[PDB]
Design an enzyme around this catalytic site. Structure first.
Site, PDB file in Angstrom:
ATOM      1  N   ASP A   1      65.787 -20.179  -0.015  1.00 34.54           N
ATOM      2  CA  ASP A   1      65.435 -19.480  -1.245  1.00 34.54           C
ATOM      3  C   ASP A   1      64.962 -18.057  -0.972  1.00 34.54           C
ATOM      4  O   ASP A   1      64.586 -17.368  -1.936  1.00 34.54           O
ATOM      5  CB  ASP A   1      64.358 -20.301  -1.981  1.00 34.54           C
ATOM      6  CG  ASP A   1      63.015 -20.268  -1.285  1.00 34.54           C
ATOM      7  OD1 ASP A   1      62.883 -19.741  -0.155  1.00 34.54           O
ATOM      8  OD2 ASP A   1      62.039 -20.779  -1.872  1.00 34.54           O
ATOM      9  N   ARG A  34      63.133 -13.168  -3.016  1.00 32.69           N
ATOM     10  CA  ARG A  34      63.017 -14.551  -3.428  1.00 32.69           C
ATOM     11  C   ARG A  34      64.124 -14.765  -4.458  1.00 32.69           C
ATOM     12  O   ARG A  34      64.298 -13.983  -5.394  1.00 32.69           O
ATOM     13  CB  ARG A  34      61.635 -14.826  -4.010  1.00 32.69           C
ATOM     14  CG  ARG A  34      61.481 -16.122  -4.793  1.00 32.69           C
ATOM     15  CD  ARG A  34      61.454 -17.287  -3.827  1.00 32.69           C
ATOM     16  NE  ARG A  34      61.000 -18.579  -4.324  1.00 32.69           N
ATOM     17  CZ  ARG A  34      61.720 -19.450  -5.014  1.00 32.69           C
ATOM     18  NH1 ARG A  34      62.981 -19.153  -5.319  1.00 32.69           N
ATOM     19  NH2 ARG A  34      61.212 -20.607  -5.410  1.00 32.69           N
ATOM     20  N   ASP A  55      64.522 -23.564  -7.114  1.00 30.15           N
ATOM     21  CA  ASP A  55      63.692 -24.104  -6.061  1.00 30.15           C
ATOM     22  C   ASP A  55      64.578 -24.877  -5.082  1.00 30.15           C
ATOM     23  O   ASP A  55      65.205 -25.837  -5.550  1.00 30.15           O
ATOM     24  CB  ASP A  55      62.632 -25.068  -6.586  1.00 30.15           C
ATOM     25  CG  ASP A  55      61.440 -24.421  -7.254  1.00 30.15           C
ATOM     26  OD1 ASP A  55      60.913 -23.408  -6.747  1.00 30.15           O
ATOM     27  OD2 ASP A  55      61.001 -24.930  -8.310  1.00 30.15           O
ATOM     28  N   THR A  56      64.595 -24.480  -3.825  1.00 35.33           N
ATOM     29  CA  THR A  56      65.280 -25.237  -2.789  1.00 35.33           C
ATOM     30  C   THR A  56      64.279 -26.044  -1.975  1.00 35.33           C
ATOM     31  O   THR A  56      63.128 -25.621  -1.875  1.00 35.33           O
ATOM     32  CB  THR A  56      66.043 -24.375  -1.767  1.00 35.33           C
ATOM     33  OG1 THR A  56      65.122 -23.464  -1.149  1.00 35.33           O
ATOM     34  CG2 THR A  56      67.095 -23.514  -2.432  1.00 35.33           C
ATOM     35  N   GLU A  82      62.455 -26.624   1.296  1.00 35.19           N
ATOM     36  CA  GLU A  82      62.314 -25.505   2.235  1.00 35.19           C
ATOM     37  C   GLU A  82      62.219 -25.996   3.676  1.00 35.19           C
ATOM     38  O   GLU A  82      61.992 -27.177   3.922  1.00 35.19           O
ATOM     39  CB  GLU A  82      61.107 -24.636   1.868  1.00 35.19           C
ATOM     40  CG  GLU A  82      61.103 -24.184   0.410  1.00 35.19           C
ATOM     41  CD  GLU A  82      59.725 -23.715  -0.022  1.00 35.19           C
ATOM     42  OE1 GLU A  82      59.155 -22.856   0.683  1.00 35.19           O
ATOM     43  OE2 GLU A  82      59.210 -24.198  -1.053  1.00 35.19           O
ATOM     44  N   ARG A 141      57.517 -10.006  -2.697  1.00 34.82           N
ATOM     45  CA  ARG A 141      58.970 -10.245  -2.606  1.00 34.82           C
ATOM     46  C   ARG A 141      59.723  -9.820  -3.851  1.00 34.82           C
ATOM     47  O   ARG A 141      59.270 -10.081  -4.982  1.00 34.82           O
ATOM     48  CB  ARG A 141      59.186 -11.747  -2.394  1.00 34.82           C
ATOM     49  CG  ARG A 141      58.536 -12.317  -1.149  1.00 34.82           C
ATOM     50  CD  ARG A 141      58.811 -13.800  -1.027  1.00 34.82           C
ATOM     51  NE  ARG A 141      58.187 -14.633  -2.047  1.00 34.82           N
ATOM     52  CZ  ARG A 141      58.293 -15.952  -2.137  1.00 34.82           C
ATOM     53  NH1 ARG A 141      59.015 -16.648  -1.260  1.00 34.82           N
ATOM     54  NH2 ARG A 141      57.668 -16.582  -3.124  1.00 34.82           N
TER      55      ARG A 141
END
EC number: 3.1.31.1
Length: 136
Positions: free
Chosen positions: A16, A30, A35-36, A38, A82
């Site tokens: 992500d 980002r 949402d991955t 992580e 980010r």
């Protein structure tokens, strides 16, 4: 009206997050709205499908000819500094590709950074229906 701007890969960091040279400056990006699992989760570290989501993003940006970043209508950076953006590899949105493959979920949405939300949600529904990866 959103617009794409060119950028250059520096390094993929996780499913992500990618570091890019943007307007001549190194920046961490980002990916908006997803949402991955992580590899570097704050508390858990390596979750299930994390290496896979991370490899998918890396391959997709490393093998691209052109990378483009697209900011949304709202804040362009988060509290960690980010960039918040949609990232395109040869015209294909990385954010959507991850969701289409069942390697990310659509995140909690914060208006007004929600321009591509329904589009991502449609791809998520299709991945869940096909029972891919996270949805298997």
């Amino acid at each position: 009206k959103l617009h794409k701007e060119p950028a250059t890969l520096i390094k993929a960091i996780d499913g992500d997050t990618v570091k890019l040279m943007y307007k001549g400056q190194p920046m961490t990006f980002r990916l908006l709205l997803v949402d991955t699992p992580e590899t570097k989760h704050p508390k858990k570290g390596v979750e299930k499908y994390g290496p896979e989501a991370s490899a998918f993003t890396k391959k997709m940006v490393e093998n691209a000819k052109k990378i483009e970043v697209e900011f949304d209508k709202g804040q362009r950076t988060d509290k960690y500094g980010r960039g918040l953006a949609y990232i395109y590899a040869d015209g294909k949105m990385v954010n959507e590709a991850l969701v289409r493959q069942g390697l990310a979920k659509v995140a909690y949405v914060y208006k007004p950074n929600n321009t591509h939300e329904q589009h991502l949600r449609k791809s998520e529904a299709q991945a869940k229906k096909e029972k891919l990866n996270i949805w298997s």
